Design a protein around this ligand. Structure first.
Ligand code: JWN
Length: 335
């Protein structure tokens, strides 16, 4: 991979790499000048030459052809694929060039949260985009701030020598959704593990089956993050994650606890969790009932938190849908 991305390299005798934009499990994404479209800059995703990532990338191309055909204007804000090719046996998918990921924008600002007026506009566009997937018998399964990109470099930035970095101020918060390598059709085989730990729904953790509602959970976690500047589930352990859920959202529904085949996590009908261990006191300390994360009691803030709370319903059958979410009072201001 290192051997076929470098600045100056030309892919498919037209795409000149000028920069690396990002990396994930799949491989890398680079910025290219397209010398055969008048020098337009594009994003090219170069996939690892590994079976599971090759298959995920053919899956992604297939989803993109479907979404881009269904929604040619990108009204529902799924990234447009321009084409795909093979480069030294790696699949390369060419995209319209977007701007920063919401992850990178927040991280590089020192994990400062987005303005509430921006979160409103971004939440709406994310729900509108993922609900278009939901309407078309798809679940994304891997919604996270890294997979939400600003459309434009509609921001300013100045070097602040006090904190020795650039601060980026957002002008227009318009986003698109990316990465359809995990996106699963209703009728296809559902992977057991989906989503990256922090944005994974309880039905996924407990292996109870999943579909569209697990996207809604993920979006709930994103909105939290946008508001605070960090996750409420900062963990790398499934049981601790569940312990964190219990502290933030209250006890798991007995019916999910009792139904799960992931019984290692439990003892009779409670999380097998030592609250009085130093790991348990860590969770109690770091985690609090959701509403206590609110930075203002202002109604606008209550409206967002009420949507977040419905998005983080434990029971996927009770969880708000995005169709419902798009009608929530938090978005009334947009209309
Ligand atoms: C590192 N430097 C940071 C500083 N820079 C910038 O502030 C500009 C505005 C010039 C810039 C920033 C980011 C991108 C970008 O990252 N754009 C992109 C990724 N990207 C990623 C998929 C994608 C993913 C995952 N799966 C499928 C597709 C799609 C489109 C796409 N566009 C562009 C310009 C220059 C770059």
């Amino acid at each position: 991979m290192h051997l076929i991305c470098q600045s100056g390299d030309v892919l498919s005798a037209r795409y000149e790499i000028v920069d690396t934009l990002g990396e994930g499990a799949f491989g890398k994404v680079v910025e290219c000048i397209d010398h055969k479209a008048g020098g337009r800059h594009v994003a090219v995703k170069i996939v690892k030459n590994v079976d599971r990532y090759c298959e995920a990338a053919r899956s992604e191309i297939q989803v993109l052809e479907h979404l881009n055909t269904t929604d040619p204007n990108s009204t529902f804000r799924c990234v447009q694929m321009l084409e795909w090719f093979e480069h030294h046996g790696h699949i390369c998918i060419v995209f319209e060039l977007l701007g920063l990921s919401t992850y990178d924008f927040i991280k590089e600002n020192g994990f400062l949260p987005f303005r509430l007026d921006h979160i409103r506009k971004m939440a709406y566009q994310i729900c509108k985009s993922v609900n278009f997937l939901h309407s078309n018998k798809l679940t994304h399964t891997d919604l996270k701030p890294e997979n939400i990109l600003f459309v434009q470099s509609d921001y300013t930035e100045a070097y602040n020598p006090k904190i020795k970095r650039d601060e980026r101020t957002l002008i227009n918060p318009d986003i698109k959704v990316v990465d359809f390598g995990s996106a699963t059709y209703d009728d296809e085989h559902h992977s057991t593990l989906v989503s990256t730990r922090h944005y994974r729904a309880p039905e996924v953790i407990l292996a109870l089956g999943w579909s569209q509602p697990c996207d809604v959970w993920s979006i709930g976690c994103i909105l939290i993050e946008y508001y605070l500047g960090f996750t409420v589930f900062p963990t790398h352990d499934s049981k601790e994650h569940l312990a964190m859920m219990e502290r933030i959202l209250g006890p798991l529904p007995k019916h999910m606890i009792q139904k799960t085949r992931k019984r290692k996590y439990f003892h009779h009908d409670r999380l097998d969790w030592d609250e009085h261990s130093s790991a348990g006191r860590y969770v109690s300390r770091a985690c609090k009932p959701l509403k206590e994360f609110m930075l203002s009691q202002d109604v606008e803030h209550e409206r967002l938190f009420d949507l977040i709370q419905k998005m983080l319903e434990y029971d996927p059958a009770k969880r708000i849908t995005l169709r419902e979410a798009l009608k929530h009072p938090f978005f009334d201001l947009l209309k």
